[PDB]
Amino acid sequence: MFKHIIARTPARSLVDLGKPDYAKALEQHNAYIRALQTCDVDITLLPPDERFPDSVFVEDPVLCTSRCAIITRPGAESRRGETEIIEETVQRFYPGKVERIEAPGTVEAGDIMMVGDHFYIGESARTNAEGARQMIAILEKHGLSGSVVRLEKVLHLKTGLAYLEHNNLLAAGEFVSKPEFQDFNIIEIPEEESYAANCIWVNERVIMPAGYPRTREKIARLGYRVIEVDTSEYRKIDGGVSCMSLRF
Numbered sequence: 001m002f003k004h005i006i007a008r009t010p011a012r013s014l015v016d017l018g019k020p021d022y023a024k025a026l027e028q029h030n031a032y033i034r035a036l037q038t039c040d041v042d043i044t045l046l047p048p049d050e051r052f053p054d055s056v057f058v059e060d061p062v063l064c065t066s067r068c069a070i071i072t073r074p075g076a077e078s079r080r081g082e083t084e085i086i087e088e089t090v091q092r093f094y095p096g097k098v099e100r101i102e103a104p105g106t107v108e109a110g111d112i113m114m115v116g117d118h119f120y121i122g123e124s125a126r127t128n129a130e131g132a133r134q135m136i137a138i139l140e141k142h143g144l145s146g147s148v149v150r151l152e153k154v155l156h157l158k159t160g161l162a163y164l165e166h167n168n169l170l171a172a173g174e175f176v177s178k179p180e181f182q183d184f185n186i187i188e189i190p191e192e193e194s195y196a197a198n199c200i201w202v203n204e205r206v207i208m209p210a211g212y213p214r215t216r217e218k219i220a221r222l223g224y225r226v227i228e229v230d231t232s233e234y235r236k237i238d239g240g241v242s243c244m245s246l247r248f
């Protein structure tokens, strides 16, 4: 289970299915935090940084494992500098246990799904081959393991996948019939609620976007305490609940 959460207040420059309204987005992020506030974890909420409109999505700049933290290197050049404004926080939680991705390799942790000590890395336009290769090398160095998953009609691996532990895996789109995931209790996500495929397990609680009944029902019947939070302003920019925090 998890003990720590890291998140970052969204910047006003975030606004630059429509553009997000700052005030509205600020409230949804607050509700997101408050929900996490009930999951028996502490929350380290970082200050907004107007220089990085997308810095609110702290999932990408780093991959926090149980044995080490790995500073990534975003594909988006405008997000690349987000690793430097989070290094110190990571350092404080992982003294002498920090690793990193070096150029020309690129990695965004949003393309990585943790399942026990194995990590599935989606090779995308944001995470190149060299990036995934480096990550896998570091993981296998610390007794962990990793493998690459080619993605076709998806930007981030975690956009259509979410492991909820106990072998339960929410899958949408191209992921439902992939050989690598055939052994998981796959819960297919209807194309109509494909957004809800992005959910986060947090100490037996499952925080999901508000407005997706079928999936919600499915998760509830599985034995999870469901907590739904409205993240409609973040949907407008391909952001889900897994994107807005680091969990370890």
Ligand SMILES: *c1ccnc(CO)c1
Residues within 6 Å of the ligand: 057, 059, 110, 155, 156, 159, 237, 238, 239, 240, 242, 243, 244
């Ligand atoms: C989560 C955070 C940022 N971006 C995405 C989709 O690219 C998901």
